[PDB]
Structures are given as structure tokens and as C-alpha cells.
Design a protein around this ligand. Sequence first.
Ligand SMILES: [Ca+2]
Ligand SMILES: [Ca+2]
Ligand SMILES: [Ca+2]
Ligand SMILES: [Ca+2]
Length: 35
Amino acid sequence: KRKRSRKESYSIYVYKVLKQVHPDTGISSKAMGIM
DNA sequence: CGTACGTGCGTTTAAGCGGTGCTAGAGCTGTCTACGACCAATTGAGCGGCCTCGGCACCGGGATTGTGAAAAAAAAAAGCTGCA
Ligand SMILES: [Ca+2]
Ligand SMILES: [Ca+2]
Ligand SMILES: [Ca+2]
Ligand SMILES: [Ca+2]
């Protein structure tokens, strides 16, 4: 087909900050949208 | 029904005005280079795609908490007295 066009986001940085602050805590897709 | 506000006086206060005198600092000019744009080549961070397995949604069952009804007490409340 085509590979879907590139959509930048902050979500890898949010996940990295979350793992410093709450190592045993994750985040729903919506939550990450809000972030 | 109780009194906080609005009105209207006389007394007091300091804003406003116009002026002067002093200089902090706003803002302008000219110089020079540290810093940011631009570029080309390099490459690794982050993208999409994909797979998985554990959190969490949902369920049923039981424990727990809170509500309302009725009956019965506690209490204020009300109408009812003669006196003074
Ligand atoms: Ca912490
Ligand atoms: Ca009152
Ligand atoms: Ca100056
Ligand atoms: Ca991904």
C-alpha cells in the first residue's frame, strides 16, 4: 500500500518522564492525547 | 420588626494647581564581534507497523451502609385560668 504519513507527538518523552516519576505506572492512549 | 443605611448639616482635611529646581535615567549614536543563519554531509533517534499477554471492564455474590416508616418519648408550645 503506502506506510501511513508521519505524525509527530511528544508521547515517547511523556513515557520517559512518567518512568522517572512513577516507574510502575502506565498511561491510556486518551491520557497521552491530553498530555 | 429592628436597625442599617441615606440624607444633610457644620467642621476638617488634603487634593489640585502652578511654579521652581534638580538630575535619574530614557533613549539615541557609533563601533565591533559573538552568535545565529545557512549549507552539505552524516547517521541515529523516532517513526509506523506488528505482535503479546496482563490490566481492567464486566459480572455475580455477599457484606455494609444509609434511609424512611412507625411507634413512643421529650419538649416546646399553646390555650386556659383566677388572682392580684
Ligand atoms: Ca517518584
Ligand atoms: Ca434585620
Ligand atoms: Ca544607559
Ligand atoms: Ca509504537
